[PDB]
Each structure stands twice: as structure tokens, then as C-alpha cells.
Amino acid sequence: DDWEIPDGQITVGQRIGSGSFGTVYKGKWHGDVAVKMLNVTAPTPQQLQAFKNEVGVLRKTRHVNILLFMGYSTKPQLAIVTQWCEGSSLYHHLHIIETKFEMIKLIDIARQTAQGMDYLHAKSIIHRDLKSNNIFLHEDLTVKIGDFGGSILWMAPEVIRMQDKNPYSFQSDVYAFGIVLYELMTGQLPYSNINNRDQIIFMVGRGYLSPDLSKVRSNCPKAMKRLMAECLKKKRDERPLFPQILASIELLARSLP
Amino acid sequence: DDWEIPDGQITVGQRIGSGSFGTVYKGKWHGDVAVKMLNVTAPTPQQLQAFKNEVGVLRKTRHVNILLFMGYSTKPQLAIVTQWCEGSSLYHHLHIIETKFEMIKLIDIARQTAQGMDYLHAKSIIHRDLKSNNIFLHEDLTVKIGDFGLGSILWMAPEVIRMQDKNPYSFQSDVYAFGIVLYELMTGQLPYSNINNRDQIIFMVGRGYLSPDLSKVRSNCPKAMKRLMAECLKKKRDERPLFPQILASIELLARS
Ligand SMILES: N#Cc1c(Oc2ccc(F)c(NC(=O)Cc3cccc(C(F)(F)F)c3)c2)ccc2nc(NC(=O)C3CC3)sc12
Ligand SMILES: N#Cc1c(Oc2ccc(F)c(NC(=O)Cc3cccc(C(F)(F)F)c3)c2)ccc2nc(NC(=O)C3CC3)sc12
């Protein structure tokens, strides 16, 4: 197999987001696509490597809850093509336009996000940057995990503390997931009463700060609230893995009207 | 670079349908999945080849309007795993529960079907059995093209019916089938409903004596679309347009 797209097939439309790791456009290639591009003439050795690394990961994935990789181009410039999601990121819903979902729906969104992560961890893919802004709510129904991009609020202590050359683990992604659950159940970002990034870093690293779980919706089930607490445990080893998380959600999910 | 699924991760659930080209079960592998598996002790060389061809083809696809292939196992038995689709086929909507879609959507369904078919043909895949029961309307708003078995004469081009050649299939026979599907969308009906004899339909379509009655299209089906249908249904292969042209024609009247 080979997913190279011949040149002059992709038409590039309106810009969507810009930053030196690439530029994202809405484009046309057998319908609507998203197109990530490097905006330079001659790319560096570090950018070329990371492109092959991104594509190497994406082509290993085929699942409804993961943004569908469609192809790449290098011919005119470096480019990665994916499906074009209609809708909004979770972040956009929760913190910009402030959509208020029914509890039944919030739990579904959670289940799907968990479903997708289960798949990645089964493939030995660690996401490293899961957060509400990299979860799209496709056609207002299906979750698509992607990477639309540091992001401190979703970072586990052992990552914040660094120290270790590789603090990332399935359990770090679980912690990130735990902060997403917090966003879903409270409709808010954590540590909203603190306006200083350095302190948040220092305090989370040291264990003096945790998300305030009393801010959860009144109709958020106890079972869910306990799942949060376990995902957000300050110690890696106590955090559950996605198979158990998934099972957990599905038990309290069916236990509802 | 490989898609094999280790033994015993798939839970085969309820049986959906079963012909001698495999059996389709609803299953569980990282969520709801469809599982088409051969139900035999020991596969024969040409069964083993059909499997490899089907897997070979599915793994060439990554497009929103094509059924998402997820993996295969040969471990306990030969099997192919795809996404599970929610809802029902276009055939079922049009001819069974007789769903009344607005024209806005019928055209949208036409567009998506064309979108996926252009993808296939760009990848050099000829479908060979395009028809409304092979078009799933997923969550009631996305077209998923595939094979949803459990032959089919109403979608066959004249050159296919005649069967003069070892291989009469082309990009243009897929276009004709698409053309018949446009007829279903735009009329709610199967073609040739006034004729109760299968061999006669076979004969006359083959000969050019019979073709779909375009006057049965709904009154608000725009003239561009009737005209488009007519070109897809032409009896000479070479006079039928290819898919980029179809996609372009539909995208034109869509926006207006
Ligand atoms: N921005 C944006 C954007 C978008 O971004 C792209 C585009 C191309 C890409 F290659 C990527 N890269 C990845 O995600 C790859 C990746 C990296 C790390 C881990 C993983 C994994 F999860 F798979 F492990 C995957 C992201 C995609 C669709 C899309 N649709 C939009 N629609 C709207 O805004 C309008 C409707 C309102 S915006 C938009
Ligand atoms: N039957 C079924 C079925 C299903 O079938 C599978 C399963 C595995 C496979 F390998 C295939 N193989 C192909 O499609 C092969 C192919 C041939 C020609 C061209 C092309 C291509 F277009 F891809 F090129 C591909 C088909 C998939 C989902 C699904 N969901 C359902 N839901 C319900 O029953 C309703 C109650 C809710 S039934 C169902």
C-alpha cells in the first residue's frame, strides 16, 4: 500500500489555523478534507522526521472514534490530509459557545472518547496531548480524537515534574482523560480561580492542587464522580487503564433512564 | 504495516445474514463492529483467494463514504471486521418503509454516493454490484458504500446483461448502476414495475428495447438532474460520463 496523493489533486481553500508546526486548510480532495501543511520552500531535517512520524502513526489507525487519515503529499510541499469534520471541538462547545448537553449525552461523549483511547493503547499509541480541543464532535454525534494543535491543565504531575526523560505512559493519557471528564461534568476548565501559570505548575507538581470535584452538575452520578477521582489520582500506579474505565462507564451508562 | 487481529479478541454476537460467500454477525472489537466470516472447517484455495482479494481492496480505502474496514483474522476462521452501521439501507428506506425524503436530501444522498464512487475509480476499484441495498444510510445522514448481501438485474448495464465478453465490467457499468440508483432516489420506485417476467426484462434491456421511464420523477426534481440521469443511463458505454463529471454536475445544481 501507499497513501501518497499525486500533485495538483488537492485544492486548498480557506485557512483554519496557523503555527510553525504547520498550517491547516479546508480543502477539496474527493469531497471536503482538512489539509495540514508546512509553510516553507525547503523543509528541515527535524520537520521531515516528525512528518514521517505523524504519518507512520496515523496509517496504523482505523476506527470510527479516531479522525480518519486519508493521505499525504510531499510533491509541492509537505501535507497531511484527513476527513473534514462538520461541527465543533469539545472545547468549543464547552468553553466558547457553552453548549449545555443532557447528562445522558455527556456520558455518551465520554464513552466514545474512552472507546477511541482504548483502541490507541491497544495499538501501543500514546497520545501525549489529549484534551478537549483535540476531540471533535462530528456531525454533533460521533467523537473524533485527533491533534489540532504547552497544555498544562491536562498534564499529570509526573509529566509536569518531568525529572524522568519519559514520564508519558498510558496512565498519563488517563489523567488527561480525567481532566476531560471534568470539563464534561462541570462545563469548565480546572483551576479557574488561579490566574498564574507558574503557580499552577508548581502546585500540581507538588500535589498541593487538585480539580475541585464539588463543581460537578447536580445530576452527575456518583459512579461517574468516583471514576474521575481514580483517573485523577496523583500516583500513576493507582490510575485505571481504559479497559476498566470503559467497562465502568458502560455499567453506570445502562443504569439510567 | 499489517492488519491481522490476534486470536480471541473478537466477540461474535448475533447473526445478521448468511449466504455461501460468508456469514455476517454483529460483533464487538473496540466497540460495535460487523464481522463477515467463513463458517467452514477448512477453506478451499479459491475461497482463500476471494478473502485475500476482498481484504486487498478494502485496505486500499480511506474515505468517509466507504465502509470503514478495521482488520481481519484467519486465526480461528477467516474473517473481516468493519465498522457497524446504524440505521438501514437506501433500498430499505426507498422501497420497504417508504421514507419520504425532501429533495434537498435525495440530492445530498446522490452527491455522497457519487463522492465515494469517484474515490473508488481514482483508486482503480470497480465496484461491480452497486445498488441501493449496498448503500447504507449511516446514522441517517452519511452514505456508506459496501457489500451488504444478507444476482441483481435492475442495475445491470445492457453490455453486462448481454454478457458477450469474459469481462463486460467497466467504470461505465458502475456509472449506469449509479444511474439506476438516481432513478430510485428521484422516483421512490424500482424500474420496470409494469413487467412481471424476469427473463423478458433481461432480454429487452440487453437489446435496448426497455429502459427506465423518466416521466415518473417527482415534480420538483430539477431539470439538471433528469438530464444527468439520462446520460448515466445511455445504452452505449462510451457515451456515459465518468464520475468527476457527475460529481461536478451535481455540485453545480446543489449550490443553486
Ligand atoms: N484544525 C483543524 C482540523 C483538522 O486538523 C488536522 C488536519 C490534518 C491533520 F493531519 C491533523 N493531524 C492530526 O490530527 C494527526 C494526529 C496527531 C497526533 C495524534 C493523532 C492521533 F490521535 F491519531 F493519535 C493524530 C489535524 C482536521 C479536521 C478539521 N475539521 C474542521 N472543521 C471545522 O473547523 C469547521 C466545521 C467547523 S477543523 C479541522
Ligand atoms: N452485511 C453487512 C454489514 C457489513 O458488511 C460487511 C462486513 C464485512 C465486510 F468485509 C464486508 N465487505 C464489503 O463491503 C466488501 C466490498 C465489496 C465490494 C466493494 C467494496 C468497497 F466499496 F469497499 F470497495 C467492498 C461487508 C458491515 C456493516 C454492517 N452494519 C450493519 N447493520 C445492520 O445490520 C443494521 C441493523 C443495523 S449490517 C453490516
Side-chain angles (χ1 to χ4, degrees), chain A residues 110-125:
Chain A
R111 199 218 93 239
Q112 291 188 51
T113 307
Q115 193 75 80
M117 297 304 290
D118 187 46
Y119 183 81
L120 296 174
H121 285 203
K123 292 264 177 191
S124 305
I125 292 159

Side-chain angles (χ1 to χ4, degrees), chain B residues 24 34 36 54 58 80 82-85 120 127 136 147-148:
Chain B
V24 180
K36 191 205 213 80
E54 190 159 336
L58 284 183
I80 313 186
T82 63
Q83 67 175 133
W84 180 254
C85 304
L120 295 179
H127 195 284
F136 212 96
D147 201 282
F148 309 115

Side-chain angles (χ1 to χ4, degrees), chain A residues 16-17 24-26 33-37 54 57-58 61 66-67 69 71 79-89 117 120 125-127 134 136 145-149:
Chain A
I16 297 296
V24 185
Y25 300 92
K26 171 170 189 153
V33 295
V35 174
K36 189 185 274 183
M37 269 198 157
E54 193 171 348
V57 165
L58 279 174
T61 64
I66 277 93
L67 185 73
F69 171 67
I80 300 194
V81 187
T82 72
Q83 63 176 129
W84 178 256
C85 307
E86 215 76 52
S88 282
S89 76
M117 297 304 290
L120 296 174
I125 292 159
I126 296 154
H127 194 257
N134 296 328
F136 220 92
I145 297 184
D147 182 25
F148 312 134

Side-chain angles (χ1 to χ4, degrees), chain B residues 1-29:
Chain B
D1 188 54
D2 203 357
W3 288 101
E4 171 151 39
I5 303 167
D7 169 54
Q9 298 183 347
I10 304 177
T11 315
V12 172
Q14 192 203 16
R15 194 178 143 292
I16 306 300
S18 189
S20 70
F21 313 142
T23 301
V24 180
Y25 300 93
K26 182 177 177 193
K28 276 180 180 165
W29 189 71

Side-chain angles (χ1 to χ4, degrees), chain A residues 141-186:
Chain A
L141 280 192
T142 314
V143 167
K144 308 287 191 190
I145 297 184
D147 182 25
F148 312 134
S151 258
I152 260 45
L153 309 167
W154 293 266
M155 227 151 105
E158 84 267 16
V159 178
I160 278 194
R161 273 183 270 105
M162 276 286 154
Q163 310 205 6
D164 220 25
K165 161 66 191 209
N166 202 348
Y168 292 107
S169 27
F170 296 140
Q171 292 101 342
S172 67
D173 279 6
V174 166
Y175 185 95
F177 175 79
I179 298 293
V180 174
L181 291 197
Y182 182 93
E183 298 176 84
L184 288 178
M185 306 326 297
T186 73

Side-chain angles (χ1 to χ4, degrees), chain A residues 1 3 28-31 58-64 68-70 83 115 118-119 122-123 139 141, chain B residues 1 3 29-31 58-64 68-70 83 115 118-119 122-123 141 251:
Chain A
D1 266 36
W3 303 96
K28 283 287 211 160
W29 186 71
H30 297 301
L58 279 174
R59 84 212 311 255
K60 286 190 269 184
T61 64
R62 286 174 164 273
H63 188 285
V64 290
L68 184 60
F69 171 67
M70 290 178 70
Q83 63 176 129
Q115 193 75 80
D118 187 46
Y119 183 81
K123 292 264 177 191
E139 213 70 45
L141 280 192
Chain B
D1 188 54
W3 288 101
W29 189 71
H30 300 306
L58 284 183
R59 73 186 291 154
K60 301 236 293 290
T61 66
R62 283 173 169 278
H63 192 280
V64 216
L68 184 61
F69 160 73
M70 291 163 67
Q83 67 175 133
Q115 223 138 43
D118 187 37
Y119 180 77
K123 299 286 199 189
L141 79 196
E251 288 168 355

